[PDB]
Design an enzyme around this catalytic site. Sequence first.
Site, PDB file in Angstrom:
ATOM      1  N   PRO A 157      69.437 -62.631 -64.116  1.00 13.28           N
ATOM      2  CA  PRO A 157      70.189 -63.560 -64.974  1.00 13.28           C
ATOM      3  C   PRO A 157      69.283 -64.607 -65.676  1.00 13.28           C
ATOM      4  O   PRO A 157      68.117 -64.774 -65.298  1.00 13.28           O
ATOM      5  CB  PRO A 157      71.130 -64.219 -63.973  1.00 13.28           C
ATOM      6  CG  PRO A 157      70.275 -64.369 -62.757  1.00 13.28           C
ATOM      7  CD  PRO A 157      69.375 -63.146 -62.728  1.00 13.28           C
ATOM      8  N   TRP A 158      69.866 -65.368 -66.625  1.00 14.07           N
ATOM      9  CA  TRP A 158      69.217 -66.389 -67.472  1.00 14.07           C
ATOM     10  C   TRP A 158      69.017 -67.798 -66.888  1.00 14.07           C
ATOM     11  O   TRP A 158      68.442 -68.645 -67.582  1.00 14.07           O
ATOM     12  CB  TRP A 158      70.002 -66.518 -68.791  1.00 14.07           C
ATOM     13  CG  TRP A 158      71.487 -66.675 -68.584  1.00 14.07           C
ATOM     14  CD1 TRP A 158      72.427 -65.695 -68.663  1.00 14.07           C
ATOM     15  CD2 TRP A 158      72.180 -67.861 -68.171  1.00 14.07           C
ATOM     16  NE1 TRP A 158      73.668 -66.203 -68.361  1.00 14.07           N
ATOM     17  CE2 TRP A 158      73.545 -67.527 -68.047  1.00 14.07           C
ATOM     18  CE3 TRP A 158      71.784 -69.181 -67.907  1.00 14.07           C
ATOM     19  CZ2 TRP A 158      74.519 -68.470 -67.698  1.00 14.07           C
ATOM     20  CZ3 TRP A 158      72.737 -70.092 -67.491  1.00 14.07           C
ATOM     21  CH2 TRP A 158      74.090 -69.741 -67.412  1.00 14.07           C
ATOM     22  N   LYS A 182      64.865 -55.752 -66.660  1.00 12.18           N
ATOM     23  CA  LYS A 182      65.841 -55.952 -67.719  1.00 12.18           C
ATOM     24  C   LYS A 182      66.336 -57.400 -67.551  1.00 12.18           C
ATOM     25  O   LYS A 182      67.322 -57.628 -66.836  1.00 12.18           O
ATOM     26  CB  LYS A 182      66.988 -54.935 -67.658  1.00 12.18           C
ATOM     27  CG  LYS A 182      67.592 -54.554 -69.031  1.00 12.18           C
ATOM     28  CD  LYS A 182      68.133 -55.717 -69.894  1.00 12.18           C
ATOM     29  CE  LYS A 182      69.484 -56.232 -69.454  1.00 12.18           C
ATOM     30  NZ  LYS A 182      69.869 -57.466 -70.186  1.00 12.18           N
ATOM     31  N   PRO A 183      65.608 -58.396 -68.141  1.00 12.16           N
ATOM     32  CA  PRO A 183      66.044 -59.805 -68.016  1.00 12.16           C
ATOM     33  C   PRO A 183      67.259 -60.075 -68.890  1.00 12.16           C
ATOM     34  O   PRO A 183      67.619 -59.233 -69.716  1.00 12.16           O
ATOM     35  CB  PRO A 183      64.819 -60.591 -68.493  1.00 12.16           C
ATOM     36  CG  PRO A 183      64.203 -59.694 -69.526  1.00 12.16           C
ATOM     37  CD  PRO A 183      64.431 -58.280 -69.037  1.00 12.16           C
ATOM     38  N   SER A 184      67.904 -61.237 -68.717  1.00 11.23           N
ATOM     39  CA  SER A 184      69.079 -61.554 -69.520  1.00 11.23           C
ATOM     40  C   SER A 184      68.748 -61.697 -71.016  1.00 11.23           C
ATOM     41  O   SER A 184      67.749 -62.328 -71.373  1.00 11.23           O
ATOM     42  CB  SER A 184      69.736 -62.837 -69.029  1.00 11.23           C
ATOM     43  OG  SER A 184      70.810 -63.158 -69.898  1.00 11.23           O
ATOM     44  N   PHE A 237      79.858 -61.441 -59.944  1.00  9.93           N
ATOM     45  CA  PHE A 237      80.645 -60.502 -59.136  1.00  9.93           C
ATOM     46  C   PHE A 237      81.215 -59.404 -60.098  1.00  9.93           C
ATOM     47  O   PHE A 237      81.184 -58.219 -59.766  1.00  9.93           O
ATOM     48  CB  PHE A 237      81.807 -61.249 -58.442  1.00  9.93           C
ATOM     49  CG  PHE A 237      82.952 -60.363 -57.993  1.00  9.93           C
ATOM     50  CD1 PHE A 237      82.762 -59.395 -57.007  1.00  9.93           C
ATOM     51  CD2 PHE A 237      84.214 -60.481 -58.572  1.00  9.93           C
ATOM     52  CE1 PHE A 237      83.815 -58.554 -56.619  1.00  9.93           C
ATOM     53  CE2 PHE A 237      85.262 -59.648 -58.176  1.00  9.93           C
ATOM     54  CZ  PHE A 237      85.062 -58.706 -57.187  1.00  9.93           C
ATOM     55  N   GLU A 238      81.711 -59.813 -61.296  1.00 13.44           N
ATOM     56  CA  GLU A 238      82.239 -58.899 -62.324  1.00 13.44           C
ATOM     57  C   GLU A 238      81.239 -57.777 -62.653  1.00 13.44           C
ATOM     58  O   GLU A 238      81.631 -56.612 -62.701  1.00 13.44           O
ATOM     59  CB  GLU A 238      82.604 -59.659 -63.612  1.00 13.44           C
ATOM     60  CG  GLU A 238      83.457 -58.840 -64.578  1.00 13.44           C
ATOM     61  CD  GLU A 238      83.643 -59.392 -65.983  1.00 13.44           C
ATOM     62  OE1 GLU A 238      83.965 -60.594 -66.120  1.00 13.44           O
ATOM     63  OE2 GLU A 238      83.532 -58.601 -66.948  1.00 13.44           O
ATOM     64  N   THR A 239      79.949 -58.122 -62.842  1.00  6.86           N
ATOM     65  CA  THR A 239      78.921 -57.118 -63.182  1.00  6.86           C
ATOM     66  C   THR A 239      78.490 -56.323 -61.966  1.00  6.86           C
ATOM     67  O   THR A 239      78.212 -55.132 -62.089  1.00  6.86           O
ATOM     68  CB  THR A 239      77.743 -57.736 -63.932  1.00  6.86           C
ATOM     69  OG1 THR A 239      78.220 -58.612 -64.938  1.00  6.86           O
ATOM     70  CG2 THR A 239      76.807 -56.686 -64.555  1.00  6.86           C
ATOM     71  N   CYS A 291      73.838 -70.531 -58.836  1.00  9.81           N
ATOM     72  CA  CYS A 291      74.588 -69.500 -58.134  1.00  9.81           C
ATOM     73  C   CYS A 291      75.160 -70.036 -56.834  1.00  9.81           C
ATOM     74  O   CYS A 291      76.335 -69.829 -56.549  1.00  9.81           O
ATOM     75  CB  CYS A 291      73.751 -68.248 -57.900  1.00  9.81           C
ATOM     76  SG  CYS A 291      72.111 -68.548 -57.190  1.00  9.81           S
ATOM     77  N   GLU A 390      84.284 -69.192 -60.079  1.00  9.25           N
ATOM     78  CA  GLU A 390      82.970 -69.743 -60.378  1.00  9.25           C
ATOM     79  C   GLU A 390      82.977 -70.233 -61.838  1.00  9.25           C
ATOM     80  O   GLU A 390      83.217 -69.436 -62.738  1.00  9.25           O
ATOM     81  CB  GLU A 390      81.919 -68.638 -60.191  1.00  9.25           C
ATOM     82  CG  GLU A 390      80.499 -69.098 -60.471  1.00  9.25           C
ATOM     83  CD  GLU A 390      79.456 -68.031 -60.232  1.00  9.25           C
ATOM     84  OE1 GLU A 390      78.470 -68.313 -59.515  1.00  9.25           O
ATOM     85  OE2 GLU A 390      79.543 -66.974 -60.889  1.00  9.25           O
ATOM     86  N   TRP A 456      67.432 -64.885 -48.549  1.00  5.94           N
ATOM     87  CA  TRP A 456      68.455 -65.411 -49.443  1.00  5.94           C
ATOM     88  C   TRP A 456      69.447 -64.317 -49.813  1.00  5.94           C
ATOM     89  O   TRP A 456      69.029 -63.255 -50.288  1.00  5.94           O
ATOM     90  CB  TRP A 456      67.742 -65.939 -50.717  1.00  5.94           C
ATOM     91  CG  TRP A 456      68.675 -66.490 -51.742  1.00  5.94           C
ATOM     92  CD1 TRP A 456      69.190 -65.841 -52.826  1.00  5.94           C
ATOM     93  CD2 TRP A 456      69.272 -67.791 -51.726  1.00  5.94           C
ATOM     94  NE1 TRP A 456      70.045 -66.672 -53.507  1.00  5.94           N
ATOM     95  CE2 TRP A 456      70.150 -67.860 -52.829  1.00  5.94           C
ATOM     96  CE3 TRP A 456      69.192 -68.888 -50.848  1.00  5.94           C
ATOM     97  CZ2 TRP A 456      70.899 -69.005 -53.115  1.00  5.94           C
ATOM     98  CZ3 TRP A 456      69.953 -70.017 -51.120  1.00  5.94           C
ATOM     99  CH2 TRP A 456      70.791 -70.068 -52.245  1.00  5.94           C
TER     100      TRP A 456
END
Lengths: 498, 500
Positions: A157-158, A182-184, A237-239, A291, A390, A456
């Site tokens: 993520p970004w 594959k970055p955001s 969670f969606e992705t 997060c 969230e 983590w």
Amino acid sequence: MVPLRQLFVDGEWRPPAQGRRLPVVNPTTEAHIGEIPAGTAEDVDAAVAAARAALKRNRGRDWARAPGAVRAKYLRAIAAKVIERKPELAKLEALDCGKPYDEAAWDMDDVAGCFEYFADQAEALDKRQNSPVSLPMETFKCHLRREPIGVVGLITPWNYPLLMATWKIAPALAAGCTAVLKPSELASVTCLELADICKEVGLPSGVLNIVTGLGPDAGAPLSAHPDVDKVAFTGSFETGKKIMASAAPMVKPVTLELGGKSPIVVFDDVDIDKAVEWTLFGCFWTNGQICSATSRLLIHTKIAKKFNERMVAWAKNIKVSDPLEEGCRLGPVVSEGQYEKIKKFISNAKSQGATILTGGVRPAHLEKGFFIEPTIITDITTSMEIWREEVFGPVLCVKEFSTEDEAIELANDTQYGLAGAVISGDRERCQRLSEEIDAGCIWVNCSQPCFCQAPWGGNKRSGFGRELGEGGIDNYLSVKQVTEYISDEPWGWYQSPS
Amino acid sequence: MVPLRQLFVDGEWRPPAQGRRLPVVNPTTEAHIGEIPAGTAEDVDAAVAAARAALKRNRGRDWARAPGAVRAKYLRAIAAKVIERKPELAKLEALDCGKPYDEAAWDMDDVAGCFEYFADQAEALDKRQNSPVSLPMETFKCHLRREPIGVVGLITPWNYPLLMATWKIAPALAAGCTAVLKPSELASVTCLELADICKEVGLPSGVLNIVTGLGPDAGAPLSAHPDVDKVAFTGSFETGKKIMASAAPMVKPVTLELGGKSPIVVFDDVDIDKAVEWTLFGCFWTNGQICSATSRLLIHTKIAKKFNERMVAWAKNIKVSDPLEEGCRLGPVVSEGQYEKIKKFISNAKSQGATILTGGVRPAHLEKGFFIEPTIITDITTSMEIWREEVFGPVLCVKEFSTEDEAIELANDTQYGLAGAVISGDRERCQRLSEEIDAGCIWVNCSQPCFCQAPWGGNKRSGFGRELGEGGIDNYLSVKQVTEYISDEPWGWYQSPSKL
Ligand SMILES: NC(=O)c1ccc[n+]([C@@H]2O[C@H](COP(=O)([O-])OP(=O)(O)OC[C@H]3O[C@@H](n4cnc5c(N)ncnc54)[C@H](O)[C@@H]3O)[C@@H](O)[C@H]2O)c1
Ligand SMILES: NC(=O)c1ccc[n+]([C@@H]2O[C@H](COP(=O)([O-])OP(=O)(O)OC[C@H]3O[C@@H](n4cnc5c(N)ncnc54)[C@H](O)[C@@H]3O)[C@@H](O)[C@H]2O)c1
Ligand code: NA
Ligand code: NA
């Protein structure tokens, strides 16, 4: 304002097959400050092909099956380069994602620290090879081999652009894997600079490949690639649901580091100003794009009134400005899409009957940019969207409690389970809450400090698995038992025909 | 002949909600020898609810959060009862799944061995709690807690009925989890006897629950249950895909121990009779129903002819009979469906141009039962179904090789990756093959010995994750870091409000 880079495939700069690009939007000004390649399925295929070829090249003696000491040298050298480029990288991080400069500088120290930590892990791997396994039969012997899992797909993520990328790259590389990052699409600037650092450090060709692009066009073909051995993913969670569903037809392993709705339980036996600062840090730092944000404050009824008033005074004192401006403590949120989502969560909370104690508006002095004042929402109900979902903005919700059991039930009243925190002078009470709150990380008398040294990860809708810590390298390793029959006697199970 | 049991839920015997049953088919006589409950989604819901209530009862103080030493006493008590009931359990195993008595007897020793190993692991877990973590800042301290992942769904196959169930139950219980086992509809008898042992040893109610039934009716609701924290699955690649797809909308963690098409590489510098016996054991033992079966023999061209001749001599000497008969070395296959599937693999091989070197037919001396002679198929081609697919019968395919690069390319010519084996007098060559074969377990100068002291699992279409070994308990534990700020100084990130 930002460099113009290409995709990084097979140790060289490669333009995208379809020649399309995506803008780099500055969240402070709303202006386009550059462009990143808009990677597609063909670019992913090329990066995976390059990662595959690099893993198998010269029977793997140049990287994959080489000693850990060799890979550790490139890891330590990448860390030296990040420290050398620290001001330019931190400035590019603040420009691309909107985080204050002081946070971005912190991130760069942690990037190098993580590369350094995993270089030691790579050297520690050599000593772990052919580890004996004691068997209950003297006629057999057993040893364990720890091999790279293979070609790994790393999707990030970004919110900590280079740090999130490093969390996966450093252990994957230390283990001897070859990777496709594959970055955001919201923040790919520093990741493309890491590609330049690798080229500059002479990291073997194809060991690390970077494909920038939109989630459905570059992320989804990487997650579903038949030639990717494991997918390590960090996102919503969606992705996370789509990532696991994409892997299922190939029984492909994945790790999922997902969202959260973490609680912070503040008892009445605290130093108010100390407790307030950690609560604000737990929800407003990273511009609320944490997060593990302790986004649900559970405050003891006896100090609630005073606590709420102190929070508002501290929140109103947070300098919100351009992230590059001296003393910035709150920058704008990453993008227009994110800003609109946060606006919708705030208006839905008002419609549902909640109280905006402070914030929930644009700061007076900032007419441009995706700027949102630190927001505190009270008179919350457990059935409200704001309590359940969230938000990912500097938005805190507050619920009061009177007993320790009400606090634990409310803390666990979530389908997430990433982190939690307890603030109390009573040590025995802090121990009880650390046991009873269901999450991968519990902070005691603080909120947010995340060390490379500790594992983590989340439980429930926050995903599964653990990254970092002394077992971090093991996420990218496959165990092989080698079991040998050392007796000269025949097995004697079947009857010899002679 | 088999006992008549019900479902095992919350320490009780409970008839299935819809009152339906499944026959227990004796594979030796093809006759119905008893019945098992045909459990459905309602029964799964009751089992999951009982496991959840047991995990949470009294703040988990009596099981989940009790010392590992307390759970170890129950695991040792279960192991002692398995040994006490060993001849009867081994007989029921042979009656239910068809494996020879001597194999079923070995499984019961391995069942008790696994419960004892995991009881030691539960005691070792206590020493691992609150482990410190050194941090690069003196203002913070960190310790690790290893907590049960929670309610676990354990779905197993019929090939080692009680042992496959034990492989999951022992480490899950050692970790402090509560569990729901869904054993195979083809072999549930001894698993229901395990529930009887649990009752006898006073295992707390709801800790272990057993729901028998068909895969889609009982297995699938368990794998997709919102209150199941993790699913540990052993079965085919076909089912493994369904398990993972079912878990995806809940981001539910799973472990998959799937099928295989494991190679055995036999070089020319070998004692023929010794390599032959291991080759046959690697494909025909468990009546060929071995997940890790070395079902592809890769034989050196210099000794191939003599090797095939010696394999046929040894195979024709295997006593095929009722598994309860003295000296049985090959029993019938589990069911009619499996017997027909195996016969179809043999006819498809014959149709594809392969040579049936020996067997490939039912034994002349056995009119009834799902009996198939030990089968060896030669003149194989890599495009053949028999090379590619898991047969799960006493059926061996043979490919000749002349170079090590060719043997390695052939060994890795599979979308599976559970296991492999190499047999050679050259130790450096054995090491090269152990490094090159892509699998979770490589046997050297043998095939099949599986120790619970060592990790077990597959790569590629054989699944992911590792069971057993020192890390086996960790599949059922969730790490929690406890990070505390010990400094008396304020955090000092934000500024205290002082402005006028
Ligand atoms: N350690 C952690 O658990 C952790 C850390 C940071 C952020 N996060 C979570 O990340 C989220 C914020 O990040 P985000 O907005 O970038 O999340 P996101 O899920 O939308 O995307 C994350 C990454 O996945 C890609 N992606 C999107 N759709 C995809 C698809 N269909 N297939 C494959 N890849 C796809 C994106 O391009 C991006 O690189 C929050 O929910 C936050 O809690 C978790
Ligand atoms: N360690 C291992 O890797 C290992 C060990 C032994 C057996 N196996 C594999 O197991 C297979 C043989 O066992 P099997 O025939 O019982 O396999 P199977 O996959 O058909 O069934 C295994 C279990 O899953 C259940 N099940 C079936 N369909 C289901 C569904 N839709 N959802 C949920 N559960 C469902 C069954 O009732 C049974 O309890 C072979 O492929 C063998 O290689 C693997
Ligand atoms: Na950006
Ligand atoms: Na049966």
